[PDB]
Design a protein around this ligand. Structure first.
Ligand SMILES: Cc1cc2nc3c(=O)[nH]c(=O)nc-3n(C[C@H](O)[C@H](O)[C@H](O)COP(=O)(O)OP(=O)(O)OC[C@H]3O[C@@H](n4cnc5c(N)ncnc54)[C@H](O)[C@@H]3O)c2cc1C
Ligand SMILES: [Mg+2]
Ligand SMILES: [Mg+2]
Length: 307
């Protein structure tokens, strides 16, 4: 088969799109110009790094009056609220002020650790309860609420590009943005698209079929000294970077937006409560956990068939 590869910058990372050419398909340059327009739009709606994005303008809004947003932004926020419910508070897109405090957002930070008083002041302006939606509108009940969609708008971008390839008659694709992946159909060799799971480096290749895959963390954090764990993933209950022994969480779901949110959420819950949610909701999840004698893999019932 003829496999076409498109690549470009978005969201402070890169995209890689592979697809199998077919008779009557639009040319690669037409498709790429539209892919770049759609991804610029995801950035102009939902990038916290763009001061004039819809999301940043909501973040700068001080009043509790409903703030009108695009249907795309509303869809992503609506899914973040549903995932907050599913992960019992662990996925909370209102931790923006803590993400920024700890040095993982657009805010310029020193290498000095926040004081207890600085940390408690940011914790006070976080909580999913401050955020409500109504039609294509968002509302904040405290002026300083800062919503961060970094954990989910990446998967959303993958879904937008995958829907656009489907809309152009392309049934055989891999869409990847910053390691968030969506697959359909068959690769160059007429086999199901191949993905590697990295283990403490050791690589197992799986075939998810028609599915999205998201991973939080990677294998390398396993080799780091003991000490306060370095992480851009915040535990909303402590206001601090997570400090559990979960190395990586991989999730499969038909939506890449959903996989991306779940992988981060279940990682925050930790393996005992995270694997119970995965079992209760038939989520395909693979967790790598660090132990004293090495690492453990926990595969959910619905992940095991891919191994
Ligand atoms: C639209 C968009 C534009 C971006 N533009 C830039 C850019 O210009 N420059 C740049 O340097 N980076 C940019 N980023 C990247 C962003 O700052 C994060 O680094 C990135 O999204 C990391 O995602 P991940 O898949 O690596 O990690 P994931 O595990 O998927 O998510 C981690 C992120 O979720 C957020 N978060 C942490 N804890 C929680 C929690 N408990 N609940 C909810 N969310 C939480 C934080 O932002 C954290 O970085 C952009 C991201 C998006 C989505
Ligand atoms: Mg995520
Ligand atoms: Mg992600």
């Amino acid at each position: 088969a003829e496999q076409v590869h498109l690549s470009g910058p978005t969201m402070g990372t890169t995209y890689n799109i592979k697809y199998i050419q077919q008779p009557g398909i639009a040319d690669s340059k037409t498709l790429q110009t539209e892919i770049d327009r759609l991804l610029e739009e995801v950035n102009d709606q939902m990038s916290t790094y763009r001061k004039d994005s819809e999301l940043s303008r909501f973040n700068q809004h001080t009043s509790s009056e409903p703030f009108a947003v695009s249907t795309q932004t509303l869809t992503v926020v609506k899914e973040a609220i549903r995932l907050n419910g599913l992960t019992e508070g662990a996925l909370d897109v209102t931790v923006g002020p803590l993400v920024n405090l700890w040095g993982f957002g657009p805010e310029a930070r020193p290498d000095v650790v926040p004081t207890d008083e600085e940390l408690n002041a940011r914790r006070a302006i976080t909580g999913i309860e401050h955020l409500t939606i109504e039609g294509n509108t968002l509302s904040k009940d405290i002026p300083e609420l800062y919503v961060d969609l970094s954990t989910i708008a990446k998967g959303w971008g993958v879904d937008v590009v995958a829907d656009y390839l489907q809309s152009q008659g392309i049934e055989n694709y891999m869409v990847e943005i910053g390691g968030e992946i969506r697959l359909k159909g068959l690769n160059r060799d007429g086999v199901p698209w191949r993905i590697a799971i990295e283990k403490p480096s050791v690589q197992e290749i799986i075939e998810p079929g028609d599915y999205a895959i998201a991973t939080s963390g990677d294998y390398r954090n396993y080799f780091e000294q003991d000490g306060v764990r370095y992480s851009g993933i915040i535990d909303p209950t402590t206001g601090r970077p997570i400090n559990n022994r979960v190395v990586s969480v991989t999730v499969l779901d038909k939506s890449c937006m959903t996989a991306d949110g779940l992988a981060t959420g279940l990682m925050v819950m930790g393996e005992e409560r995270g694997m119970a949610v995965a079992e209760a909701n038939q989520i395909p999840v693979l967790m790598i956990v660090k132990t004293d004698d090495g690492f453990k893999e926990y595969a959910s019932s619905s992940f095991k068939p891919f191994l």
